[PDB]
Amino acid sequence: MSHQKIIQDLIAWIDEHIDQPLNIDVVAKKSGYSKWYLQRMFRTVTHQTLGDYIRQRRLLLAAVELRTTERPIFDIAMDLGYVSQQTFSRVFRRQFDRTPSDYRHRL
DNA sequence: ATCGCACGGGTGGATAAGCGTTTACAGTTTTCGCAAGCTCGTAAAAGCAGTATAATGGGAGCTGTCACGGATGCA
């Protein structure tokens, strides 16, 4: 089994469990590998990062929880690896170039 | 393969501070509304003086009955 089949399984590993507290100590242990070694092979298969991409699906989930659900900004961050919305609102100007308040207005 | 270690990138984390937006909790101004209290007015209630043939002593339904002592008080 080549490693390009490993990371193909890893793209369906998280697509249901980004609302869960999913950390690297779960992803590495339930893959059969170590904590660091999964990140070296992750570059040569999809050209992007791993610890930011789980945020990139988490910040994708916050936008589809804002354009559909009435949940506030402060405690969507509580389930997605943040302890407050102060940093969680800040990276959204990097990921989608918008404010977490301004997305729901422009339809 | 299996996995750390490091230089360094990215960040998360702990105060902190930011932003425009729609109401508090501070204090007075305004108007309107209806009284409780005073003043009043007169029709009703309240009070007062007089009435010139002549008239001059209650009882007025009472009590219908018991009988034994003490003090009182004339005689």
Which residues are CB-contacts of A13 (< 8 A; sequence separation ≥ 6)?
A27
* Helix/strand/coil for A31: helix
> Rg of chain A's alpha carbons, rounded to an integer?
15
Q: Is the CB of A21 under 7 A from strand B?
A: no
**Resolution of the structure in the document, Å:** 3.4
Q: Is the CB of A86 under 7 A from strand B?
A: yes
Calpha distance A70→A43 (Å, rounded) = 37
Q: How was this structure determined?
A: cryo-EM
Structure-block tokens of residue A36: 């660091």
B chain positions with any atom within 7 Å of a protein CB: 2-5, 10-16
The distance (Å) linking the CA of A1 with the C1' of B69 is: 146
Which of A16, A18, A42 is closest to A28 using CA atoms?
Answer: A42
Calpha distance A106→A104 (Å, rounded) = 6
Task: Give the helix ranges, DSSP H, for chain A.
Answer: 3-10, 24-27, 37-46, 53-64, 73-76, 85-88, 92-95
